[PDB]
């Protein structure tokens, strides 16, 4: 009885600690996301020059034709907005998978420098999306935006539901392509090909680390194990659903905001162009890496994502 009570105090202590660690890991995911988000947004903003097209059109008011610039502005403004939302979603899922795998590993080792080296490397792989993988996503988005919006005159008046529906159709095309096994675009956008793993580390870590890392071939094998696990998760239909859901929730928050601004101003139909401009202002809100950004807080705290994280954290049979 006494010793049974001692065991139950140990097991309580363990469950308290495991819960404390999970909770802290989830906060660390949100905090790492916010720190990386500027490194991701900058490339996208430079590539999709919504503001430069806007300035050229105004210049003309008072060299591509006006017609050309307006179709270019339509595709690029929507492309940028969905590219942000998809890349953010992929980074969120990516970090939640990475950090939860590692946290579990740590928790087990405790419950029982080379190990730390394989963890450091694994964490480095966020570079790929930040410096390459996002482009594939942008290409896929641009293609799908063309498929749905390419023929629509910017002058045309749409309701917010009509517009939401068009956005949703775009999304369903994107999703069908990026999850399609060719390894999906998701995988190739978040992870380097096998032959480029050492390259990634050489881009992200110094010679001291690389020397220590390469001294023991077990380090490379350990990283391959973590990457296999991670890739396993990324190929899973439930993870795909969650990426889509994050984007969906993003769009929802943005459109709610646009609706409120409209109602405040004065829902009547509005010209497509007006929605392009609205989206562009709201896009700016997705890129804000502030603790007070409620949209990013929401995305990082969705129930499906907690459920996923918890399944990973507790997958001891990996």
């Amino acid at each position: 009885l006494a010793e049974l009570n001692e065991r139950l105090k140990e097991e309580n202590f363990a469950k308290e600690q495991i819960k404390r660690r999970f909770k802290q890991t989830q906060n660390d995911c949100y905090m790492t996301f916010l720190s990386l988000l500027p490194v991701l947004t900058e490339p996208i903003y430079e590539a999709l020059k919504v503001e430069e097209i806007t300035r050229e059109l105004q210049n003309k008011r008072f060299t591509k034709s006006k017609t050309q610039l307006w179709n270019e502005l339509r595709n690029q403004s929507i492309t940028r907005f969905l590219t942000l939302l998809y890349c953010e979603s992929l980074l969120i899922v990516f970090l939640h998978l990475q950090l939860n795998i590692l946290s579990r590993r740590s928790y087990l080792e405790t419950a029982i420098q080379d190990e730390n080296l394989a963890e450091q490397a694994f964490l480095s792989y966020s570079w790929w999306l930040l410096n390459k993988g996002w482009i594939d996503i942008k290409n896929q988005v641009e293609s799908s935006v063309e498929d749905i919006f390419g023929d629509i005159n910017p002058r045309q008046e749409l309701s917010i539901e009509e517009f939401a529906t068009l956005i949703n159709k775009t999304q369903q095309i994107i999703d069908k392509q990026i999850y399609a096994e060719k390894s999906s675009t998701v995988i190739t956008s978040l992870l380097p090909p096998a032959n480029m793993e050492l390259f990634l580390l050489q881009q992200t870590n110094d010679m001291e680390f690389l020397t220590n890392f390469n001294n023991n071939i077990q380090n490379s094998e350990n990283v391959s194990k973590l990457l296999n696990e991670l890739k396993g998760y990324l190929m899973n239909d439930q993870v795909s659903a969650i990426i889509s859901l994050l984007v969906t929730v993003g769009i929802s928050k943005v459109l709610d905001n646009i609706v409120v601004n409209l109602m405040n101003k004065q829902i009547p139909k509005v010209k497509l162009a007006s929605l392009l401009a609205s989206i562009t202002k709201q896009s700016n809100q997705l890129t804000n890496n502030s603790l007070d950004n409620e949209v990013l807080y929401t995305l990082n705290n969705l129930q499906e994502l907690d459920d996923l994280s918890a399944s990973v954290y507790s997958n001891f049979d990996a």
Binding site: T54, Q58, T67, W70, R155, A277
Partner: peptide
């Protein structure tokens, strides 16, 4: 072409 003309106003809504 006048469709385009009317569109011109909306350029300012990008500010």
């Amino acid at each position: 072409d006048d469709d385009l003309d009317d569109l011109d106003d909306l350029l300012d809504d990008f500010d």
